């Protein structure tokens, strides 16, 4: 056989049109007048403003966010609002260039086997794609997440992904990572089963925090 | 502008499949509470559904729910040890939904496969993986795959792209080497054989 | 009419054009207790790279071997001949002798690999006998300096294993993308972290290490 005429099947196109977006969030802190990393995690640039989604927990306590976009731009980021009840955080940064938004499109219904990348920056690798497919779009009845509108998927989901971006292989946003299943019950360790926000409420919860705070 | 476009998605066998696919509780006096969980697969009309032995062992009562919202007790029809399979027994009137099977798919290394079941309680879950391999004490022949199975995942099914049962998820590798987790290891009791297995136990034979 | 050619989807082509050509590694020493019998002391998979029998294996799965064994899946089972390892890729390469024609890796020279490419990982994880799983490109490498050290690794979410060392990574076409090498194991379990060596550097060391063994 010859191969070298056939097309690798691929989800570069998604790839390409959100990953620019996602962008690396470090949480540094004082410990002397030198800063230190004490969390890492993934953010969402959302409009061309310089509005950005992430993790609330990435940016507790923090003494200077840093945002840094794999065009390799850094800013300091300002943050605008949180909610605990959601776990989203809105930062902000201010930029001459132009920034790279992550494709939304607000008529898409995910569903149950769509296939799904999560984007992110686990252990500080660097940004990092990983496949899966949407597990569940939320719940009817009580479950151990305590909420009924999580996206759950089996995207390789690691610590320093929350805050980062689950789009479908159109590169459209699905959801933020958030969560990752860690309670063994008897010594076996979850595996593929990860959370992430639903897009259409990460929108509202940021819309509202830009406005209130 | 991807509004037209169309997402890669493996729905279609969601549809076909997970309608047939069962939480199955263990429930144990207290009152009563459960005990163990898994998962279930309605195989046809009579309402006869596979799951896994080590799921429903020493149950006080057996329970049976659709992902429609019906809830039924289910009788223990009968188990098989070899192969760590069993069959259950639920109200057949009203209509039931059942899984799809090709009596006639071979299923191949590489055929993009969905596990369902329930794992951790946490309501019926999707993932995705390939069989990895196949014909793997024990004299067991299993399909291999990396479609993740978590805890409650046992008895639940393993189906193809077309919604087609390939198999009943049994197992998960756990056996560290040098103090490490294994991942993506996980082992179906191939769909002909579990068929097989279940025909003998509701025999009785 | 009544029985129609539906057909699920399926990576198959893949594992038919390139799994023949992996093979399970096995590195055996003898032992001073039981009669100097050979026993396995460590297992990997390796690649066969051309129809002379050059095999491409990590050099951690063959150090300090008395004896190096390679099965392949048609059940051939051959003595291999280290032909010379390098420490900086951690890449060796082995020699065989077969009657036969041997199975060799599909290499497209020209492809170039992709972020967001289903690969398929094949190899023996825990000597169960070959195994494929699925991912894909997570990076084709790393611009700024990072926890692996180096700028050129492969990282794909295939789940990889101990015993998928010196193993294929190939794309959908069942084209080589790359030696598998690494996981990312110890801190927090990682999950779906695994690197491989590039087709293109693992083919330039293994003509260096044909031509001098070194």
Do not use: C, W
């Not at 640039?45 to 840094?68: E, F, L, P, S």
């Not at 933020?176 to 990860?194: A, H, Q, V, W, Y």
């Amino acid at each position: 056989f010859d191969s070298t005429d056939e097309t690798p099947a691929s989800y570069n196109l998604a790839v390409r049109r959100a990953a620019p977006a996602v962008v690396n969030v470090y949480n540094r802190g004082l410990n002397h007048n030198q800063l230190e990393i004490r969390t890492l995690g993934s953010g969402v640039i959302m409009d061309q403003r310089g509005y950005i989604i992430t993790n609330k927990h990435v940016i507790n306590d923090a003494d200077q966010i840093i945002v840094a976009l794999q065009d390799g731009r850094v800013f300091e980021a300002l943050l605008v609002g949180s909610d605990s009840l959601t776990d989203l955080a809105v930062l902000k940064i201010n930029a001459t260039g132009g920034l790279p938004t992550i494709p939304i499109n607000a008529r898409r219904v995910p569903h149950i086997g769509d296939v799904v990348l999560a984007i992110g920056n686990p252990y500080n690798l660097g940004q990092t794609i990983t496949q899966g497919i949407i597990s569940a779009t939320g719940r009817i009845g009580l479950n151990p997440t305590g909420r009924q509108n999580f996206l759950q998927t089996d995207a390789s989901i690691n610590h320093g992904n929350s805050g980062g971006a689950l789009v479908n292989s159109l590169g459209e946003l699905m959801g933020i990572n958030t969560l990752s299943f860690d309670k063994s019950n008897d010594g076996e360790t979850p595996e593929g089963i990860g959370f992430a926000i639903p897009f259409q409420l990460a929108t509202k919860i940021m819309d509202k925090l830009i406005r209130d705070g």
